[PDB]
Amino acid sequence: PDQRAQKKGDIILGGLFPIHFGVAAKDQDLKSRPESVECIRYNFRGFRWLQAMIFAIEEINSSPALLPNLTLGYRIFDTCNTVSKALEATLSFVAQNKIDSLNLDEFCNCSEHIPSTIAVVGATGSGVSTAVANLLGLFYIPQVSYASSSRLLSNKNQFKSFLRTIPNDEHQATAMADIIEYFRWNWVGTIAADDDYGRPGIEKFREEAEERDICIDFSELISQYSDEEEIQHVVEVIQNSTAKVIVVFSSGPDLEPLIKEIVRRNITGKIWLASEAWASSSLIAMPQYFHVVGGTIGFALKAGQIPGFREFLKKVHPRKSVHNGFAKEFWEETFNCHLRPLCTGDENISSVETPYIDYTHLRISYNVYLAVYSIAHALQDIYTCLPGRGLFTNGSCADIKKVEAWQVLKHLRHLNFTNNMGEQVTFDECGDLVGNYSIINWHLSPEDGSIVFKEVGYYNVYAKKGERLFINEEKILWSGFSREVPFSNCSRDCLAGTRKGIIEGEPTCCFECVECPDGEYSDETDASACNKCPDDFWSNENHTSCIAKEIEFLSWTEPFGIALTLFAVLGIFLTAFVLGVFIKFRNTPIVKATNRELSYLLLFSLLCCFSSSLFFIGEPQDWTCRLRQPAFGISFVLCISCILVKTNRVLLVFEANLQFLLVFLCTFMQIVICVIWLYTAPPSSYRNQELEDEIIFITCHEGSLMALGFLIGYTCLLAAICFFFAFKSRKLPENFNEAKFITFSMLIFFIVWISFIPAYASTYGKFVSAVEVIAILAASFGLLACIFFNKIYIIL
Amino acid sequence: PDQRAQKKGDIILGGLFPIHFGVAAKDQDLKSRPESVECIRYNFRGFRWLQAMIFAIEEINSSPALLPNLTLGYRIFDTCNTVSKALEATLSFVAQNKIDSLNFCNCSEHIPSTIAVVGATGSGVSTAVANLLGLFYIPQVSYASSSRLLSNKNQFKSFLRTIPNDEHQATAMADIIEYFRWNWVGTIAADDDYGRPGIEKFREEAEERDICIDFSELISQYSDEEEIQHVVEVIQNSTAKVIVVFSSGPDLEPLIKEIVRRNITGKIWLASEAWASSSLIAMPQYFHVVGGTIGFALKAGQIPGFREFLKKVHPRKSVHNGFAKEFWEETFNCHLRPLCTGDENISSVETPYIDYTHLRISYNVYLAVYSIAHALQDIYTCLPGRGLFTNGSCADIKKVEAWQVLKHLRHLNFTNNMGEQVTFDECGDLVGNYSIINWHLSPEDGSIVFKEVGYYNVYAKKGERLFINEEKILWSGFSREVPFSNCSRDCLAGTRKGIIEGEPTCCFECVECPDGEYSDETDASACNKCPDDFWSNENHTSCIAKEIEFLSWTEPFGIALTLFAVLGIFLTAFVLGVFIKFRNTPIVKATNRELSYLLLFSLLCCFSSSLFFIGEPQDWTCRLRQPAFGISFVLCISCILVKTNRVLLVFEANLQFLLVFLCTFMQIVICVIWLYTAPPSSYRNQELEDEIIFITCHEGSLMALGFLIGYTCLLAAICFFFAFKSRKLPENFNEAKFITFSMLIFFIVWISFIPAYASTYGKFVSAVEVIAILAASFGLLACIFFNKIYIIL
């Protein structure tokens, strides 16, 4: 390495910064002796970090309070983000230690003029720094990095002298998961880089997503040296996916070919998530690409303050700066000339617009500044060590004249001081720091069309999980110009009345919506299953909620019921035209039956025949006391018996007072059978019919219907017997044709049941009570009309 | 590095082998100057590999057909599975190139420079060594590094290997998992460069093949007790019986010991190639925890004369090999506490150094050494004018450089002692077959043995690369039944799936298919919808056909209707069939025999129409039952109604015979007009009454039938009005009274069956209609002919 930044001093430090983005991308066939690689691109941020470190060292050497008489030198080389260059620089650093503490088999002699460094500033990448630390751990030389946040460097078993001044990015995955949870999504992507920074950083994110039940569509890995095949495959995978959110864990140059290919293919409508590595890189954030990476949300560190730095940055000159060997190359790259046209030392560094001269926040430079002062404070603590109170064995103390690397590492292990801003800086036993992570968004400046970063929130690491992040949605512009929150889900959420259904070969986050069948209802949206038991209710047409069932039965409240009751009471009134108001019964001339008894009985007999029809009307169980367990046969057992005794009285004169006792004996069998039935045998009722539809049915199904059939058959047989007995003498019309019309009156009763048997068998709306009551009422009207034909001839 | 194996020569080769499994674990507080670490336990497999390399070098140096005038030396250090120890050896190897490349430094010229370095046994150690060796373009060949991270040529330029990569092993394990009926498995990996890269591919394959993973954990050799306890608790609190392990011997040893201490059984263990045959875990005392373990092994090789060279090791005569002094002490438990002598036997003590059945890593080392020798021979034997360098130039064997050796090694193709061809790929990788082994218990020795139960191919198409013999696999060491490892039992027939919240797709519930649809396959995603003409079974297994009821003639009610119809036909033919004498008969008032056969055939046609009314609407394709609706209401009644018309005409006052056919004319023309206006159709839908399909008839403009019935009723009413004043007096065989009584019977029959028409049992409207028609016709014929059938003549 001919180019170097070397300054002499009593104590020598080591530094490694990236000045070039990469090396020549050429393959060697090894046909001849290989040569060293050559740089292709130039970096300006590394020069800024180098200048900041030089300024910090100079301020240390210019502060008598920090160090009275100690002068510190430095040796800085270039890495170019290459493992080989950093390994060569580290080997050159540890040559004095290598010749002495190593290679004991053979005698190795070297010049004493070369100095020995006490510490080496770590590299930027997480892979190069890993190799540098692995090689440095043999000699116990401390190494402090400023940009490595990989977890693989946190293992103290493999690395013993590695420290970092950048907060660990393990909380970055948690913050991204919380961001995804806040803007509720379930379909996301995953793109990482094949290195030591991307692969370990995606496992934690995937674990957090799985813990939060977040589905991942595709996961891909990219690299800077990959050719067109992998880039095309990744582009095809991205295009063939419906995920609108992509998580990217990569660097600037690593992601540059993918961004260029996407821009060439004009792929838009995607959301880009940026980590701290590439949230502010100038290689990706360009106006020409603003239509592909617009509205990008990224992570950034906490800004620092370095007084007297802007003025120092303008003092660089390629002629009066002999200590710095990179000034000439920086000048040539900035002014784009040779030292084609000749260039003198009379330009202005602030004319050309380059990132070296303009900046908004110093994060990595502040990290290097803090590391340099941490080393200075460790040296000061070594100098100020008091006898009798030390960190070595038996209370020993070190000598400032002869300081070894292991003593510096031991003193750096237990370090605590105050920052220039009043903060407290100390090193944890894992060699890691804790700091805030900030959220930034990309916007377009209307003035000159330049990409700018705006703060729209922050992440806290000193609070309990759940409320560690704050965000302001009103200041976030999605896709660069859109304000509404984009919709990125595998499928639409199920609405009310629909349930979920599995699709074969698909994850849990993807499903289908299926309408629930009858009898099932669901109120909450996206319900796993619908309620099955409506608690004696019915499912609605839309299955939104439950509906109470309807009770349908014959009642007097309905117009049909009130009309039937009015007809019944009218019939009761029409049989009271003699019962209620009676004509003279003494020496009655119209009827030969002078005696009031056995003839006045027919009045209240017909009254009971009419009144008994009111048992069937209304609900069977409407009243508790009047539950009417016997309902059917009571009407028959009295009315048929009265008809039979009347027919017997009529026939005794023609076919054939002890008659009153004689008529009752024949009908006594009906009454004793009914009394046995209605008391000894307790009838029941059927509460609900077959429980299928929303229309419920109530009915009174008397127990032991065979007894009812038997008693009806007995009554019919007795009626037929009396009809047959009356038939033999009804042909001859005598005595006001009395016997001639009773036969027709009771034949009306017979033909009522003949004409209403299909109504008994089948009825509309389960109204067997209605047909029964109308049949018995019509029979009662017929009997009443044809039983009092003698009164219409003569009033009295 | 005082402990080393050195032999000088014209050409020097480097080598690294693991002689110890690790180093002493102690924290450094930096109170004083740190000292070098020490290795605690000895290893015999690394010593066997070193002996194999020495034997190969000696065989090459004692062969005239290979490098006849060249002498080969070696320089081998110790690694102890430590990164720092290997880095020290790597730095010592590149001491000569340090002055030439870096930066002045003066060094003695007596020290030689190695041209090749044998790769390390580990993965991260090999990566660290190759990172430093790549600067000087020094070729390096490894024998046990199978990590994919070494397959990147951009970072590594002088790395070669003779072992298949881990991608094939992961694919084979995925195929094994897919072969068995398991979908709920675990995952355990080691925090190193061998385990983590070897689990991403396996997880991707499992996700592609629709395989769920229960838990994933990382373990390490230096992990404390808390991590081990957490891993054990996670494993115990799981329902998975199959566990995938990607770790080495010492890495997995603490976890195995902790599991044994807790006496955890009933688990299926899958072993990677790294620990499928390690003696640190395969112990009888742990057998009841690792019984029936399936592991992967490579293809063994044959090295004639190896055992004889192994059985002649001596700590005194082996001046070149300085590692025998410690090996003798370790294998005999002595030192040079009880004093020892150089007269013991090596065969006696049972050690893995001499007790072995196959050689896999040693064969790899032999192949690597022979590949290097073949490259050197090709360098020596190259002819001018056809060299691979620029302008056809060829190198000189007197002065050889590392880059030339690497270039010739990149293009290598030779043959083995077993008649096999060995080449090098563009990435320096090799391919080979795989073997599957199972762990069994010796019946008398009591030790763990390996049995071959199958193999995996790499030269065949996808899906036809694995062969498994189930008749030799013994699960759990003694069990025979195939283990069952599923999240939940599969749904039976007629039962569909149901989702559980916050659970993977591999876990679900079984819910019975509701009524109206069926599923005839197990683990059905959804219940298949039944067809229109089929209904779901009681058990919902499949669909069943429905039934149709149409009052067939074979029905008891149908045959009853038939028997009444034929009885009526016979009774009416008793009068019509026989031509009884009607000469000067006084039964009929009219002398002419006409106006009597009219009724006789009208009743017959009415009976025929009533009989034809029943049956299917489409029983006969010639004509539908439509006339059965019409004529039965006009031909049956109006022709009979002619007698009532003539008798009312007589009461009002061969001349009126033609004047009483008008009613039939108007009724038939109205029927024809209705039929042509909107012919009746047939309704065969289910009408949402029930699941049973019913057949019925529907006609447009149904009010026409009501109007026809109303016209008939009005005609009968006007007949009653006309005959009311004539029926009071009885005369002429009481014909008027009997006709009035017959028509009253007709009215009472028509109005008696009104609620049956309104509602009928079983939707048998046709049965009600035919019953009413027959009853009315029978009463009519029995009552109008009351005096015409009382006496035959």
Ligand SMILES: O=C(O)[C@@H]1Cc2c([nH]c3ccccc23)CN1
């Ligand atoms: O660990 C790593 O590799 C990244 C490197 C990196 C970070 N921030 C940067 C800014 C510019 C350039 C590089 C970086 C943070 N950690």
Ligand SMILES: O=C(O)[C@@H]1Cc2c([nH]c3ccccc23)CN1
């Ligand atoms: O790459 C690695 O780290 C492993 C190391 C290893 C393999 N086979 C072994 C047998 C014994 C000891 C160690 C090993 C295969 N690849």
Ligand SMILES: *[C@@H]1O[C@H](CO)[C@@H](O)[C@H](O)[C@H]1NC(C)=O
């Ligand atoms: C980080 O943000 C929180 C939020 O108030 C707070 O602790 C502080 O302002 C920031 N810095 C540190 C060191 O916490």
Ligand SMILES: *[C@@H]1O[C@H](CO)[C@@H](O)[C@H](O)[C@H]1NC(C)=O
């Ligand atoms: C997307 O799916 C998630 C799954 O939990 C859900 O919470 C979210 O509401 C869905 N998005 C929309 C817009 O409904």
Ligand SMILES: *[C@@H]1O[C@H](CO)[C@@H](O)[C@H](O)[C@H]1NC(C)=O
């Ligand atoms: C376990 O699940 C798999 C998933 O397809 C299935 O093939 C297998 O039959 C199930 N096991 C049993 C015993 O049914």
Ligand SMILES: *[C@@H]1O[C@H](CO)[C@@H](O)[C@H](O)[C@H]1NC(C)=O
């Ligand atoms: C690997 O197995 C296959 C099939 O059994 C066959 O090619 C041969 O036996 C093996 N091949 C090699 C190169 O050993």
Ligand SMILES: [Ca+2]
């Ligand atoms: Ca770097």
Ligand SMILES: [Ca+2]
């Ligand atoms: Ca970070």
Ligand SMILES: [Ca+2]
């Ligand atoms: Ca799938």
Ligand SMILES: [Ca+2]
């Ligand atoms: Ca090793």
Ligand SMILES: [Ca+2]
């Ligand atoms: Ca392998």
Ligand SMILES: [Ca+2]
């Ligand atoms: Ca979960």
